[PDB]
Design a protein around this ligand. Structure first.
Ligand SMILES: CCCCCCCCCCCCCCCCCC(=O)OC[C@H](COP(=O)(O)OC[C@H](N)C(=O)O)OC(=O)CCCCCCCCCCCCCCCCC
Ligand SMILES: CCCCCCCCCCCCCCCCCC(=O)OC[C@H](COP(=O)(O)OC[C@H](N)C(=O)O)OC(=O)CCCCCCCCCCCCCCCCC
Ligand SMILES: CCCCCCCCCCCCCCCCCC(=O)OC[C@H](COP(=O)(O)OC[C@H](N)C(=O)O)OC(=O)CCCCCCCCCCCCCCCCC
Ligand SMILES: CCCCCCCCCCCCCCCCCC(=O)OC[C@H](COP(=O)(O)OC[C@H](N)C(=O)O)OC(=O)CCCCCCCCCCCCCCCCC
Ligand SMILES: CCCCCC/C=C\CCCCCCCC(=O)OC[C@H](COP(=O)(O)OCCN)OC(=O)CCCCCCC/C=C\CCCCCCCC
Ligand SMILES: CCCCCC/C=C\CCCCCCCC(=O)OC[C@H](COP(=O)(O)OCCN)OC(=O)CCCCCCC/C=C\CCCCCCCC
Ligand SMILES: [Ca+2]
Ligand SMILES: [Ca+2]
Lengths: 380, 380
């Protein structure tokens, strides 16, 4: 347990010695294009170190609060870079991304995915599943893990299913304002919504039930029994300390209902601007930046979701929202503003009439539900 | 007291609305040289806002913890910029400072100040004080305020006087390794050390005694009596909540003595690298950057000095040093490394023999004092 309360002046000394050595004893190259990137990277690294060693501890502790402090600092850095990218012109921002990786900044080609439907197709005699084969890509294994983590983040069945359904309706309405969207109805539902609910959401709820019926008693690593107990402790150190499963009961007040609606809206906007950011900044879907963003968003979303539940469930008259939820909301707003700024012509396309009627019907149905809620509250 | 517990989501909404307006509804200029500076400034402003609204509260509260959070964030930004400047070449760093202000990046002329001594000089019959007149500049009014604040920061007589004396000896030894240093012996002592001890240090100790014999009882701004009480409360709101005067007793152990020596060394290095930074980065002494650095260092030094006293005086087995002291130490180390890197040829000049003998005598005297301390501890 030495590392769990280790000193910070030792970290300061190590950092100072390392940077002093690498700056003085080495030879500085005579080109500014490399030294500028080196300085930016060094500043980012030092900020990460200082935050890891001196930031606040979040609600999550295991495996080490330094992990969540590191992710908080990464969130801060990402927000700063997002704002810097926002405040420039579009082509200069794309060239800045080209500075990040020397392959971006060029118009990538566009292709359609849902061009082939009717799985039982006699077009290709050799393979009946010729239409399915192209669909069976890394997306399907990604959906299971993604929704497993996203249902570990929010810890509710109804909220999770409503978020998934709302996002799928939004994706269908999003098809003509972003041409890469092309999915058949079977691929839309059976391949995505069916798979998520059947496997990812179900496994997340099973994990919550399994690890919410456990006794959390821990002791030292050297007081445990022989190698069997050693391996048991090593494996279980990455299991959570103790959680409180969230219970979002929205039909009890008005502010609580609006707060649940707001967090649902933020969750939807996260995925919306994820897709629109991978589109408008001219980054390929398989670029490592997108995967890094996904991992960071998974971790930061879990922490911020716990923090916003803690803020929402408090009985005290005035509580300040945790910094992680604030940072996630700021990042989402900045990403949405970037998306609106960079490509407004493609985003401003008018909705299809036949789906706009359905959207209006849903809106009026929600309004009727709200007024009926008010009526029943008045009666009671 | 509305602002003392006001909401943070309101701040987030205001920031998001203002940045979205200034980015979208305005027209982005078609030059990257202005947009890059605009983006950097916007990122700095957003980081300042987020830190002010969501950082940790330091030991100092009055007039508002937001003030000290703002100074902590400024410290973070200054450290990051210092490291970025460090990791480049010397000429590129000077041109970066030229980017900060379009007049820097040029070799400024060098002049001597202590070229005229012997105040009672019959060289100029018209004015006997012709030598004094050039000396009587803004430096003397600056010394009083500077040492008043610096003795409010450390809250001790002996430590303050020893720091002043050590810094003056260091300045005298620093004359040939930095040519701008030129002061006559009277200007060295009577004009600086005499004035500080007579006025600044004495007024600081008088203020500490006066405001350490006060009863700190406060109430609301609307429960006070009429306009007399209103003005009294308005004036006294900027008076401190309640302080605990530090008492540095170094002759009790060895770790405590070494800690006092370390904080004295950091205090000396702060002024050393202040002068060497204003010299080596080609900034004129009267540039606003130097004054901003002085103000920031005054505030951050006070906060970090309280934090390091709190860390040093704790009885608990393990306490983490406050972030402000960590940041001040990091900034001092980074500034010293920049000074060593940029102009090593001027700094590496061999010290004068006649003063090197005095320095060796002082060092051996300190060693004898330490061994006598060990001898007396062994006897007792
Ligand atoms: C030996 C095997 C090494 C691998 C391993 O997982 O060790 C597990 C060790 C041991 O737990 P602990 O720190 O003593 O518990 C601290 C204290 N009792 C507490 O829970 O509070 O603790 C850890 O190893 C924790 C993993 C740290 C991961 C760092 C960031 C990821
Ligand atoms: C390096 C790889 C490690 C990746 C994460 C490992 C991990 O299990 O973190 C699990 C994290 C942290 O949970 P906690 O600190 O115990 O706090 C629980 C809090 N009370 C709560 O309400 O949640 O909280 C979670 O992310 C919950 C996921 C549990 C999955 C366990 C299987
Ligand atoms: C009316 C005159 C305005 C000028 C002025 O100084 O008002 C003074 C006001 C009034 O103190 P308070 O906030 O009610 O005290 C909070 C609480 N009772 C507490 O001490 O805890 O409080 C203040 O005005 C404090 C000055 C804030 C300065 C902001 C950064 C500098
Ligand atoms: C805007 C202009 C305001 C400039 C600073 C005003 C000011 O008086 O800050 C005074 C600051 C902070 O005082 P505090 O919150 O009470 O902390 C007391 C702490 N417990 C301590 O031991 O200090 O602490 C100090 O800097 C002490 C200076 C006192 C001078 C009063 C005359
Ligand atoms: C921290 C708690 C959650 C995680 C628990 C364990 C933490 C460590 C696990 C790390 C494992 C890395 C996972 C690798 C990434 C991965 O598997 O895929 C990422 C998956 C797969 O991508 P998909 O979008 O599903 O596929 C697109 C199909 N067209 O992506 C995702 O998970 C998306 C996550 C979105 C997160 C949204 C964040 C917003 C959450 C809350 C904010 C809401 C409200 C709070 C804010 C403000 C309140 C006022
Ligand atoms: C916060 C507590 C202290 C201030 C109290 C009130 C705060 C608000 C007051 C703001 C007023 C602004 C003052 C304007 C600036 C001013 O008057 O002059 C600045 C003066 C005048 O300049 P001089 O160097 O004296 O003249 C040169 C002569 N050759 O400059 C200074 O005050 C120098 C201050 C140096 C401070 C050093 C900081 C380091 C302190 C502690 C760190 C040490 C240990 C902790 C770190 C690590 C521990 C392991
Ligand atoms: Ca889909
Ligand atoms: Ca002097």
């Amino acid at each position: 347990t030495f590392f769990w309360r280790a000193h910070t002046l030792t970290v300061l000394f190590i950092l100072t010695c390392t940077l002093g050595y690498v700056t003085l004893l080495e030879e500085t190259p005579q080109d500014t294009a490399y030294n500028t990137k080196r300085g930016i990277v060094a500043s980012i690294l030092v900020f990460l170190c200082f935050g890891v060693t001196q930031a606040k501890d979040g609600p999550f502790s295991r495996p080490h609060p330094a992990y969540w402090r590191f992710w908080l600092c990464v969130s801060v850095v990402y927000e700063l870079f997002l704002i810097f990218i926002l405040f420039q012109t579009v082509q200069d921002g794309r060239q800045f991304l080209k500075y990040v990786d020397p392959k971006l900044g060029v118009p990538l080609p566009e292709r359609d995915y849902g061009g082939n439907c009717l799985i039982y197709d006699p077009d290709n005699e050799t393979d009946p599943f010729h239409n399915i084969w192209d669909k069976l890509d890394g997306f399907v294994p990604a959906h299971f893990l993604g929704w497993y983590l996203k249902t570990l983040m929010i810890r509710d069945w109804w909220m999770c299913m409503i978020i998934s359904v709302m996002f799928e309706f939004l994706e269908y309405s999003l098809e003509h304002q972003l041409p890469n969207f092309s999915e058949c109805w079977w691929d839309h539902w059976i391949m995505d919504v069916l798979v998520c609910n059947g496997l990812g959401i179900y496994c997340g709820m099973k994990t919550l039930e399994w690890l919410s019926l456990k006794t959390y008693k821990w002791q030292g690593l050297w007081n445990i029994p022989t190698y069997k107990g050693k391996m048991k402790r090593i494996a279980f150190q990455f299991t959570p300390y103790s959680w409180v499963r969230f219970e979002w009961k929205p039909a009890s007040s008005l502010r609580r209902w609006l707060a649940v609606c707001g967090i649902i809206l933020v969750f939807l906007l996260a995925e919306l601007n994820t897709f629109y950011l991978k589109f408008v900044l001219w980054m390929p879907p398989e670029h490592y930046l997108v995967l890094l963003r996904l991992v960071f968003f998974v971790n930061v979303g879990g922490v911020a979701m716990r923090e916003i539940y803690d803020f929402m469930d408090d009985p005290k008259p005035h509580k300040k929202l945790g910094p992680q939820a604030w940072l996630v909301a700021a990042i989402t707003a900045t990403e949405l503003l970037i998306v609106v700024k960079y490509d407004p012509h493609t985003l401003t396309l008018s909705l299809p009439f036949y789906i706009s009627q359905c959207w209006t019907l849903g809106s009026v149905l929600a309004l009727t539900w709200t007024v009926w809620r008010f009526f029943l509250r008045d009666i009671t």
